[PDB]
């Protein structure tokens, strides 16, 4: 799967290149050049061909950059994938060669995957597909606020770097002029009586409904550094997590949470409750509120009303 990455690696710039330049380059025929060509074709990447002359991207990719990833974070074990099945795959399939904080990033998925059996779509170098290991000492008690704990994060971060307007879903999402923009796939593996294993999933659209990315919303940001910026917040609250529980988040939270004092729907399997959101409690549940009437829910689904 070579080839491919080093094609893709210089048309990386959005200008032209015949496949004339690019065969003495790579060592290989023009003829070879277009097969590889068609591999890329196929992550999703937009290729514009011109029959006997050359190639070209419609679009300029900034791709990950491990060194430039690396480089920062202070001490850290990521992983940058560039092609495989899933970023949550990927460590499942590995649980016991990882330790806490563990992560990794591609450039593309080719399983991406949402919560509900549902497809997540990751091509090439369009947008942030990573995932984090963590492991949890009293075991597969908690998790719940670990992910409010990672929206939160995931929040600030963007918050920070510009997009000074997204907001959090309870239980996962991000939110931006209302429509998703980030997808959040947390999955358990325990044991009574064991640590609970996590690996956590983040999608975050990028690239140009009801879902929202950030060129649309006009915000333009660096791929590496949001990656980066990301992992290293997360090792620093899920530790502190590890330390804590919610109760260092609650008041943050609330101040990104989408929907607090506004009307919605929660579900448990087909279980419809409405009304209106007083927030989270000291459980990561959910506040419901039903004729002056504020109840704790851990589970269902939350749309708007
Ligand atoms: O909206 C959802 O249902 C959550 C989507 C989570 C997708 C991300 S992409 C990186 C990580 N690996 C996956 O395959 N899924 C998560």
Same mark, same amino acid.
């Given at each position: 799967?070579?080839?491919?990455?080093?094609?893709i690696?210089?048309?990386?710039?959005?200008?032209?290149?015949?496949?004339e330049?690019?065969?003495?380059?790579?060592?290989?025929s023009?003829?070879?050049?277009?097969?590889?060509?068609?591999?890329?074709?196929?992550?999703?990447?937009?290729?514009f061909?011109?029959?006997?002359?050359?190639?070209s991207?419609?679009?300029?990719?900034?791709?990950?950059?491990?060194?430039?990833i690396?480089?920062?974070?202070?001490?850290?074990?990521?992983?940058?994938?560039?092609?495989?099945?899933?970023t949550?795959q990927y460590?499942?399939?590995?649980?016991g060669?990882?330790?806490?904080?563990?992560?990794?990033?591609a450039?593309?998925?080719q399983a991406?995957?949402?919560?509900?059996?549902?497809?997540?779509?990751?091509?090439?170098?369009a947008?942030?597909?990573?995932?984090?290991?963590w492991?949890?000492?009293?075991?597969?008690?908690?998790?719940?606020?670990?992910s409010?704990?990672?929206?939160?994060?995931?929040?600030?971060?963007?918050?920070?770097?510009?997009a000074?307007?997204?907001?959090?879903?309870?239980?996962?999402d991000?939110?931006?002029?209302?429509?998703?923009?980030?997808?959040?796939?947390?999955?358990?593996?325990?044991?009574?009586?064991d #640590?609970?294993?996590?690996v956590?999933?983040?999608? $975050?659209?990028?690239? &140009?409904? =009801?879902? /929202?990315? %950030?060129?649309?919303?006009?915000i333009?940001?660096?791929?590496?550094?949001?990656?980066?910026?990301?992992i290293?917040?997360?090792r620093?609250?899920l530790?502190?997590?590890?330390?804590?529980?919610?109760?260092?988040?609650?008041?943050?939270?609330?101040?990104?949470?989408?929907?607090?004092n506004?009307?919605?729907?929660?579900?448990?399997?087909?279980?419809?409750?409405?009304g209106?959101?007083?927030?989270?409690?000291?459980?990561? #549940?959910?506040?419901?509120?039903?004729?002056?009437? $504020?109840?704790?829910? &851990?589970? =269902?689904? /939350?749309? %708007?009303?």
């Amino acid at each position: 799967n070579t080839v491919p990455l080093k094609l893709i690696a210089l048309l990386a710039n959005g200008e032209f290149h015949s496949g004339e330049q690019l065969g003495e380059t790579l060592g290989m025929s023009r003829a070879a050049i277009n097969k590889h060509i068609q591999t890329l074709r196929d992550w999703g990447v937009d290729v514009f061909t011109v029959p006997g002359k050359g190639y070209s991207l419609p679009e300029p990719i900034q791709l990950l950059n491990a060194k430039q990833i690396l480089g920062q974070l202070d001490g850290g074990s990521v992983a940058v994938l560039p092609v495989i099945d899933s970023t949550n795959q990927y460590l499942l399939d590995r649980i016991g060669e990882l330790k806490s904080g563990d992560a990794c990033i591609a450039e593309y998925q080719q399983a991406g995957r949402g919560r509900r059996g549902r497809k997540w779509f990751s091509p090439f170098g369009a947008n942030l597909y990573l995932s984090m290991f963590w492991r949890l000492e009293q075991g597969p008690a908690a998790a719940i606020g670990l992910s409010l704990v990672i929206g939160i994060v995931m929040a600030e971060v963007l918050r920070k770097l510009g997009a000074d307007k997204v907001r959090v879903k309870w239980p996962n999402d991000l939110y931006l002029q209302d429509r998703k923009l980030a997808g959040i796939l947390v999955e358990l593996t325990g044991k009574t009586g064991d #640590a609970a294993q996590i690996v956590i999933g983040a999608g $975050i659209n990028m690239a &140009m409904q =009801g879902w /929202i990315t %950030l060129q649309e919303a006009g915000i333009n940001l660096d791929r590496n550094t949001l990656a980066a910026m990301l992992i290293r917040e997360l090792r620093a609250a899920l530790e502190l997590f590890e330390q804590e529980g919610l109760a260092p988040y609650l008041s943050r939270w609330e101040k990104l949470d989408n929907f607090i004092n506004r009307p919605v729907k929660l579900i448990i399997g087909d279980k419809e409750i409405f009304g209106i959101s007083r927030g989270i409690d000291k459980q990561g #549940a959910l506040l419901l509120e039903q004729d002056g009437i $504020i109840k704790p829910w &851990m589970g =269902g689904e /939350i749309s %708007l009303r």
